[PDB]
A = this chain, B = another copy of it.
Amino acid sequence: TLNTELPGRTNAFRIAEVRPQVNGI
Chain A 1-25 interface residues, beta-carbon cutoff 8 Å to B: 19, 21, 25
Q: Quick one: copies of this chain in the complex?
A: 3
Which applies to chain A's interface (DSSP): helix, strand, loop or mixed? loop
**A21 contacts which chain B residues (CB < 8 A)?**
25
CB closest residue in chain B, given A20 = B25
**A19 contacts which chain B residues (CB < 8 A)?**
25
Report the minimal beta-carbon distance from A25 to chain B, rounded to whole angstroms. Answer: 6
**A25 contacts which chain B residues (CB < 8 A)?**
19, 21
Report the minimal beta-carbon distance from A15 to chain B, rounded to whole angstroms. Answer: 15
Q: How far is the CA of A2 from the CA of B1 in the complex (A)?
A: 38
2 inter-chain pairs at a CB distance below 8 angstroms, sorted by A residue, are A19-B25, A21-B25
